[PDB]
RNA sequence: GGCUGUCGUCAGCUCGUGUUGUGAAAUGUUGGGUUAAGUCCCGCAACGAGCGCAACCCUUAUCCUUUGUUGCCAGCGGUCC
């Protein structure tokens, strides 16, 4: 009766051993998180995003899988919300400089091709 | 000084910002391939930028438009041809 989390887990054995809590128990050689733990985080992720989008805050998608990271583009431009796509090596979040000139001469260049 | 040859039209050289490191410093500037090329994709704590490479300059090949002389003679005329 509630929401996604009818799943099992994805490890066999590399569990983080910071995972102490969050496992229900360890069978048939496949670690299973705590799927009943998954009452609350729904209910503060959407406090603090309600307070946030009070001020109508951004929230960036990110992902890096074959499926999965095309599947958050639908997520953004359906709340018209800010994302990226595969492959985002790091530094822009701390070198704005460079990621900001990109972006804006990038897009400029696009518009102006 | 200026100017010149030199490796060598070889492809590398560094910087801003980031990151890592107490720090000198490293990263960037890595593998796969790929190019003539640090040429470029893919995974990568780095993104980018500069000189770099190409290209922009000159010449050549096809065609077209304009002008038709001192240049040409497809058509017409006879020709001191």
Aim: aromatic share 10%; charged share 25%.
């Amino acid at each position: 009766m509630l929401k996604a989390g009818v799943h099992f887990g994805h490890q066999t054995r590399y569990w983080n051993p910071k995972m102490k809590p969050f496992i229900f128990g360890a069978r048939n050689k496949v670690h299973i998180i705590n799927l009943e733990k998954t009452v609350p985080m729904f209910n503060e992720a959407l406090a603090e995003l309600n307070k946030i989008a009070s001020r109508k805050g951004k929230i960036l998608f990110v992902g890096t899988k074959r499926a999965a990271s095309e599947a958050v583009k639908d997520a953004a431009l359906s709340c018209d919300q800010f994302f990226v796509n595969h492959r985002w090596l790091g530094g822009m979040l701390t070198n704005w400089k460079t990621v900001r000139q990109s972006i804006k001469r990038l897009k400029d260049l696009e518009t102006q091709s």
